Structure formats: structure tokens, C-alpha cells
Design a protein around this ligand. Structure first.
Ligand SMILES: NS(=O)(=O)c1cc2c(cc1Cl)N[C@H]([C@H]1C[C@H]3C=C[C@@H]1C3)NS2(=O)=O
Ligand SMILES: NS(=O)(=O)c1cc2c(cc1Cl)N[C@H]([C@H]1C[C@H]3C=C[C@@H]1C3)NS2(=O)=O
Ligand SMILES: NS(=O)(=O)c1cc2c(cc1Cl)N[C@H]([C@H]1C[C@H]3C=C[C@@H]1C3)NS2(=O)=O
Ligand SMILES: NS(=O)(=O)c1cc2c(cc1Cl)N[C@H]([C@H]1C[C@H]3C=C[C@@H]1C3)NS2(=O)=O
Ligand SMILES: N[C@@H](CCC(=O)O)C(=O)O
Ligand SMILES: N[C@@H](CCC(=O)O)C(=O)O
Ligand SMILES: N[C@@H](CCC(=O)O)C(=O)O
Ligand SMILES: N[C@@H](CCC(=O)O)C(=O)O
Lengths: 270, 260, 260, 270
């Protein structure tokens, strides 16, 4: 009996092949997450089928309806068996599912449109109107928004730090809506907003987007926090311990570092 | 019921307070791990007594004896209830004890005396004139011993077959040996201890190259214990609300006794 | 008995003189390989007639039919007696024909139109904006096809799954395609032809990086023939006497019609 | 039936371990040639034993007796079965033994004691009293010699090029004798002669010696010719085709280049 692997279309984790039209099965997808699933299968023997979540969401719990959507909702209600996807370990998620030891470290960063070079001996330098989250909160001419129904939005919602509280107070009562439905939508808003918008996303996707063409976006300031991505399984399932030791073994062998290097920096340009 | 806590003397995590001669209980200890234990006890709701491991070892299994030592031996043999200390999460420990979610990122770092001729680990392996060592019975020696990569294989062959013995008994001994070798000996340890040492006096060592890999410290509980989920959820909450970051900043950067 | 020699029209090895319209026999050919054939015939003591391969292919086996073409096909099927031409010594060819000792060292090189951004082969593979090809039915293509190295595997996947067809029919076609690509196309070919091209007009291409591997050209003789030992000993004698070095200097460096 | 592999104690081809006293068998020796022998055995299965020649010579036919001494002598007479050692392909050697395809290209070079840097804006530049073989032959204050009973000595003896002829005419009649019994003896002569001696040796050994400490020797000019190293086998023996095919497979797979890189350039002491 094969298990269901639920994923989310996000680069470079789960991308779509340019020649996927006539391909059927797990061979249509490629990226970091498919390689991680292959290595997990190699360590502990099992057959898997890759599925993309229906709603295209990472997972969130409704305030009143009190149900989980996205991959978390898929795992809790039994529609899937394991989620090999960039799912962030959070306090609320751990109370409903089981998270393995993180296979990648990350943080909350800022994405802004890369500013024009400063002409004024004859050296060329770059200036940025945003240098950190504090000065981002202090100003008003540059708006900022996050990805809806994600770990970052919930972190900003429950944050008790004064600067993050101010940022959340702005975001929750901003017209027009500053949130986006997908990471690609947020990046597109950044690129088309002539520098009048800043995107708060995970540092891994931030670096990935910065490295590729048209290389017109850059990351400013340090990581707002330190989190990770875990492989999630439903509470009490028998697939938790095997994938835990699988992740540990992959970390010890150095396969994870090689995968990060070959999917993130090896394909860079600009 | 008071919960016994095993911990090791390793600055800045645990330090012997200056007035510990007139102090008793857990009031004679200070550091990052003391505050972490206090927060864990406050969240879970248990009373704890901080006891230092008898031997200054972290944990390993002797070949052809299969006996655990250090704090891991304290945990598996029932002599200790929880290990709130910089215990690196490894495969050989996950099969014996329960590790919580990581609370501190770290990696393998190279320390030398104050051009950086060595810089890279690969270039370090390409050189024989300068010597390098590691702490015995730790996650570093076991990582180098069982690493199947060519560079790490060469490094482990170097360290195992070396005279005089290049490993050090304690991390402080390793840093002293680096200091008093006139730049002929290098020490490999976790990046956190490296940063803490290089930010302190006499500020005569640096950190070169980069982290060889990435690991994390975790709160350790005996396999099947009842404190696993409470401490794991406590660690997640503490990281979520930023207590861990503030503790690290207080015990690592807040002093900075050097020009930087 | 006149010995039939199969050879290919590749400069500077074999050229069609300047007035081949008024010449008959072997007097209408000139080049390094013509001189080498003359020396081999003089040493062994046989009369030879130089015949050009009908199809401008060096030789390869075709999948699902296992039929040899080019000069190797001309040799395994009895149509030719010897192949005095720049035929790279390879594994697949050695299983069906007798190769003499190498008489000219060579390697696989990269050439782009006139610091070059391409640098080495690893950067050339990593950088996708520039396109790289290879002459079809040649040892370089067969080298990349069965190569198990990661960089060469990526390169072979690129060239195989490329639109339009990045391969070229002849070496001159590849050189012209690089020249007229405005710096968008890179040609992979043997070191000797690359140097000969880059030391000639219009002197607008340069060889970059290093050699991906080291190989050699050999005199090809049908398996189990009576000419293999005499030609191998002749090659050894010619190399010892410095005739091969003299011929290479005459046909490669003696002209130098460019600024260098 | 185990065949015997004959080698010559030459670095970095066949070297003695620092703990060979307590070791017995094919584990005492190490270097490039032992790895080549291991790979040849792996590709075509056979058991082998490593032996060092008693006379410590590569091979040379004696005048007025027409007998071969050294590795070629012990392979021709049948006392050995295969010579996996840096044996140069020569015309005289190929007429008595079957010699495989070359596994490494080499050339005759010149090694002199590295000269002191010139003091005289403030840049330091090195000057050498020898720049090629021509000005080496023309002068008379710097002596030069070659390994006795080797391929280079026979190349110089039978050479018809005018400069090489003059060099051999000097070498064959010169007191005291300029030839050396071993390559290490020639290197020691170069280092102890304070620069009044030059040594002619293979380019591979020359580069290896230059890259080791104390690196007081350097190579001048360029290679006088192009030659190779092959795996020797007695004439009309059953091992010729297997080892030829094996060395071809090793060359195509890229093992030879990696071995050369790991034994020659990896161990750099200057
Ligand atoms: N360099 S990286 O961000 O791709 C990265 C990050 C991490 C890795 C491995 C890599 Cl390659 N493994 C660790 C794991 C190893 C053991 C210690 C912590 C977890 C369990 N988690 S991590 O610290 O989140
Ligand atoms: N900045 S730091 O090294 O003190 C640090 C490091 C880490 C923190 C929190 C902090 Cl403050 N939390 C993560 C944990 C939180 C949740 C997400 C990953 C694990 C589970 N581990 S970590 O990535 O090792
Ligand atoms: N200088 S060159 O490229 O024209 C060149 C190249 C080579 C030459 C001779 C010359 Cl002149 N001889 C060798 C052969 C001679 C004997 C030693 C190795 C093979 C057998 N092959 S080679 O190393 O490919
Ligand atoms: N780079 S090197 O000198 O170590 C070197 C030299 C040579 C290699 C391989 C290497 Cl790695 N293979 C060739 C062989 C391959 C095929 C073509 C010529 C012989 C048969 N001989 S070589 O040209 O003498
Ligand atoms: N990676 C986050 C969502 C992306 C984001 O919030 O930027 C998660 O898995 O919840
Ligand atoms: N803190 C590490 C030991 C440090 C080291 O590896 O040197 C451990 O518990 O494994
Ligand atoms: N001369 C080569 C072909 C050149 C190439 O590989 O491009 C051969 O005979 O194999
Ligand atoms: N390398 C030569 C001998 C050494 C020399 O001539 O310098 C050979 O194998 O014959």
C-alpha cells in the first residue's frame, strides 16, 4: 500500500518540467523536494506518489470555522500521509501534526526592488531606502505585505515585539490589501510596484529569487528570526520515526548540503 | 518531585559563579543553559536541581564495549532525568535518547592563532605543516571518524594516525593549545564556542573558512520519557516568542570585550 | 600490391593543394598526413594510393544497427587497407581495429569568438546563456555520451536535448557557426585543429580553458593484419628521429599568419 | 596462478610507507603505480605481487654481450610477468617486448638548482644562467649528466640532431663521470653542486621534485621530445590485450587524470 505525498508548487522545491506534457507520474516534477522524497524512499523502503495540494496553501486554521486548509489540513484530516514540502515548523502546527528534525534552516527576510546605482572618485555605489525592519515600520511611503495563509502571517499576527506589533497593526488595517495569494504573486507585485512595495518571505526563496534573472530584486537586512522546514506526518502515524532517522542520516552524510548547493547556487546567474 | 538535570561546564552555557563558595543549590550556576533550564521549568511546571556531569564528557560509545558515557550515559542509565546542555543532535544519539527540536544553530569551525593561509578546510587538508585536532568523545570526532567524503577521510586518517596525540581532553585545553603553539596547531569545534572565544580576551584567535556543515543543540530526554512533549512544546514557544534569540544576544554579544 | 589508404579532408592534415585540377594520383594532396603516409611507406616499403572517405565522417557505430561508417567502417569492411588520418584512439574503435602507438597528443578544447566569460568547462556548463556543440559522428560526441562525470553528464544532457540541433556536420561548419554566432555559440573540438584555426586568418577565435582530457591520433590498421607491426615500428622510429616533431612544426607553426 | 609485477622504486610512482616495517605483502608499497596496478587488476581479475628489481634499473641492453638488465632484462628472460612501472616506450624496447598504450605523456627536461632572486621599481625578478638545451650545449662551465642505463641516455646516445649529438659527445667523454646511478642521486648532485650541475630527467619526475620541499630546484626550457609510459609485457604473451583494453578503459573513464592530480599536484609543499 503506497502513501500519499502532498507538496506545494514552489521553486526550487517543486517545479514543473518544460517537457512534462507527455510525462505521467512522479517524473513530471523536479526540484529540491522531489530529490528529498527520493532520498527518503532510498533510506526507508516505500513507494510514494507526488500530489500538489488543491488549494495551493501551506496551511492555516480559521479563527471561527476552526479547520485547517492547505497541506496541514490535508495531513490532519487524512487526505495525505506525509508532506515533503517547505513547511515551516510552528508552535500551532506541532500541536496537530508531527514534525521531524528540520532539513533546512531559514528566516524571515525582506524583498525590495533593487535600487538604481548612484553615479556620484568615479566610484559607483548603491543606496536603499530600507535598511532594517525597524526603519521599514517607521516609514509610511513604502507599503509591505506577506503571503496569505502561511507561517509568516501567523508569526506577525501573534508577535509581541513592539516593531512587529506595529507592522502587524499596519498590515491588518491596510487598504488596498497588501497580502498576496502566492509567492510568485508577491514577487510580481514587488517588480511591478516601482519600488513602492516590500515583500516579507522566507530567506531561502528570497536568495533564490535574487540569484536568478532578471536579477532586479534584493534582500535587505538580516533574518528577522530563525526557523526551519520539517517533514510532517499525522499525529501517531508510524512513518514519523523512519523519516526522522532518514533526515538525520541524510544530514550526517552531507547529502542535504550537496542538494542545497546544486539546487540553489549552482543554477545562479547575474 | 524535583527533576535532576545533567549539565556540563562549558562557557557561556554554564559557568561557575564567582560567589559560588557562599552559594548553594542552583543559585551558584549561571549562563545560557541555566536560563534555558529556568524557562523550561517555568513553562512545564516542574522543580529542577542542576547537577554537573561527573566526567567532563558529552557522550560516546566505546568500541567493543557498547557503554555510553558523559551526559548521554547519565540519561540512558537512569542517573539523569533531562540534559539541558549544548548536546549536539546526532544519529547515534537519536537511537538512544529523545532529542527536542533544535534551539541553537551551529557547525564545525576552524580556529587558528591571529592573510589566513589555511582559510579553507580543503586547503587545510592539503597542508601538513600546520596541525589540527578535535575534542574526544564529541559530535566532532565521531563526525570525522564516520565521514565518507574524501577530504574528511584524509582528515580523520591524519588525526587518528598522529604522534603526539592531537586530540584534546577539554575544549578549554584545545583553545589553550592553539594559543600556545605559535600558530602551529589548529582546533576544530562548534561555531558557537568559536564565536564566544574570539569575542573574549586575549582576542588572539580568529575563525577561518566556513562552517563545514550545520547541526543544532537539543534538549535531551531519556527514550519514552513523559517530559518529551512538554519540553519540545516549550522550546517551540520560546523560539516563537523570541526568548531564545534574546538569551543568545545577552550571553554572546552583550559584552564584546574586543574591538569589533 | 598497392595499399589503399583511407584519409579525410581535414586541415592541416590533408588539403586539396592549390592546383589539384591539373594533377593526378597522390600529387594532388598535401599536408601533415600526406607526409606521414609518405614516411610510413618509405619505411615499410609499400606503394600506396590515397583515397578520400566518401562520407566526411571519422567513424561511429549506429544504435539498433551496429554498422560502422566513416574510415572505421571503410576498415572493418575491407574497403581500405590503412587509415593514415587524425583518427582518435578510443575504446569502441580498439575493439574492431588495430591502432598503432599515438603519434600526436591532443585533447578536447573550447573555442569562442574573440577576459573571456566562459573560463573553464564547469563555468561553461553552469552558464546557460551561451550554447555549446560538437561535431557529430566523432570521438568527442562519443566521449560526452558515455561520460559518467557530473559536469560532462550535464553537458551531454544539454546537447542531446537541445533545439535547434547544436551539433555540426563538419568541423569547418562548427568553426563558421562560432564565427557567425556573434559570441553566442561555442565549439568543442580537438586541440590540434583548434590551434591551427586560431593561428590562421581571420584570427577572430580563441581557445579558452584547459583540455578536458588527453588522447592521441593513431595509424589505424584492420584487426589481424600484416601491416600493424611494420607501421607501429615505423611510427616509433619516426618519433625517435624527431620526424613527427619536424612535421608538426612545419604544418602548424611555420606559417603563423596572425599577430602573436 | 599469481603473476609477478615488477616495479622500480621511483617517486611518486612506487614509494615506501612510513610504517612498512610491520607490514607484509602488497601493503608495504604505495604511490601512483600501486594504484594503477590495483585498477588494472580490478578491470581484469588476476592476483599480483609487487617486486622491486634487484639492480634498480629501468632497462638497457649491454654492448658486446647483447643482454638486457633491469626491468626489461627480467621481463625478456621470463623471470617477471608484467612491469607496471614508469617504463618509457622506446623503439629498442618494443622489438623485444610487447608494450601497451601510454598511460602518461612525458618529455626530457632540464633541472638546475634554483637561482637566487635579483635585487633590482622595487620588483624582484629571477634570472637563470640556462634557458634551453642550445645554450646549455654552447657553454662549458655548467656540467650535465643523466641517469645511467635508462631511456634518456640511449636517446642522447643515438640522437642525430646536432645539438643533442654535441651534448652526447661531451657526456660520453667527461671526467669526472656526469651520469648517476639513481634519480635521487642526480637530484642530490644538483642540490650539492651549488648550481654548477644540471640534471636531465623526465618532466613528470622533474615537476614532482620541484613541488616538494625544500623546492630548491626548478625546470628550465621545455620538453626536448614527447614520449610516454606504458605497461610492459613479454613478447607474445596472453596479458597484452587485457591490459591494453584496461588502460584504455581507465583513460576513457577519467581515472588516470584523477590519479595524476592526486599524486602530483595535490601534495604541494611550496
Ligand atoms: N545549510 S542548510 O540551511 O541547507 C541545512 C540546515 C540544517 C541541516 C542541514 C543543512 Cl544542509 N540539518 C539540521 C538537522 C541535523 C541535526 C541537527 C539539527 C537537525 C537534526 N537541521 S538544520 O540546522 O535546519
Ligand atoms: N538565532 S539562534 O541560533 O539562537 C536560534 C536557532 C533556532 C531557533 C531559534 C533561535 Cl533564536 N529555532 C529552531 C526551531 C524552531 C522551530 C523551527 C525549527 C526549530 C523548530 N531551531 S534553530 O533554527 O536551531
Ligand atoms: N610534439 S607531438 O604532439 O607532434 C608528438 C607526440 C607524440 C610523439 C611524438 C611527437 Cl613529435 N610520440 C609518442 C609515442 C612514441 C613513443 C612513446 C609514446 C608513443 C610511443 N606519442 S605522442 O606522446 O602522442
Ligand atoms: N594528463 S596525463 O599526462 O596524466 C595522461 C596522458 C595520456 C592519457 C591519459 C592521461 Cl591522464 N591517455 C592516452 C591513451 C588514451 C588513448 C589515446 C592515447 C593513449 C590511448 N595516452 S596519454 O596521451 O600518454
Ligand atoms: N514557508 C512557509 C510559507 C511561506 C511564507 O510564509 O513566506 C510555510 O511553510 O508555512
Ligand atoms: N557539544 C558537543 C561537543 C563539542 C565538540 O564536538 O567538540 C557535543 O555534545 O557533542
Ligand atoms: N578526429 C576525431 C574527430 C574530431 C572530433 O571529435 O570532433 C576522430 O577521428 O574521432
Ligand atoms: N624514465 C626512463 C628512465 C629515466 C631516465 O632516463 O631519466 C625509463 O623508464 O626508461
Amino acid at each position: 500500500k503506497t502513501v500519499v505525498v502532498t507538496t506545494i508548487l514552489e521553486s526550487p522545491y517543486v517545479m514543473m518540467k518544460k517537457n512534462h506534457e507527455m510525462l505521467e507520474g512522479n517524473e513530471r516534477y523536479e526540484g529540491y523536494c522531489v530529490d528529498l522524497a527520493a532520498e527518503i524512499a532510498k533510506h526507508c523502503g516505500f513507494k510514494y506518489k507526488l500530489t500538489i495540494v488543491g488549494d495551493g496553501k501551506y496551511g492555516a486554521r480559521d479563527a471561527d470555522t476552526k479547520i485547517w486548509n492547505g497541506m496541514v489540513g490535508e495531513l490532519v484530516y487524512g487526505k495525505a500521509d506525509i508532506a515533503i514540502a517547505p513547511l515551516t515548523i510552528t508552535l500551532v502546527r506541532e500541536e496537530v501534526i508531527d514534525f521531524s528534525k528540520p532539513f533546512m534552516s531559514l528566516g524571515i527576510s525582506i524583498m525590495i526592488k533593487k535600487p538604481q546605482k548612484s553615479k556620484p572618485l568615479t566610484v559607483e555605489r548603491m543606496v536603499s531606502p530600507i535598511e532594517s525592519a525597524e526603519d521599514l515600520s517607521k516609514q509610511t511611503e513604502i507599503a509591505y505585505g506577506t503571503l496569505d495563509s502561511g507561517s509568516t502571517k501567523e508569526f506577525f499576527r501573534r508577535s509581541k515585539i513592539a516593531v512587529f506589533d506595529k507592522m502587524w497593526t499596519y498590515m491588518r488595517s491596510a487598504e488596498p490589501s497588501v497580502f498576496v495569494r502566492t509567492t510568485a504573486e508577491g514577487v510580481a507585485r514587488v517588480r511591478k510596484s516601482k519600488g513602492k512595495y516590500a515583500y516579507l518571505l522566507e530567506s531561502t526563496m528570497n536568495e533564490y529569487i535574487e540569484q536568478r534573472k532578471p536579477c532586479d530584486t534584493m534582500k535587505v537586512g538580516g533574518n528577522l528570526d530563525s526557523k526551519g522546514y520539517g517533514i510532517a506526518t499525522p499525529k501517531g502515524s508510524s512513518l514519523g520515526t523512519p523519516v526522522n532517522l532518514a533526515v538525520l542520516k541524510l544530514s550526517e552524510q552531507g547529502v542535504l548540503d550537496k542538494l542545497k548547493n546544486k539546487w540553489w547556487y549552482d543554477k545562479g546567474e547575474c
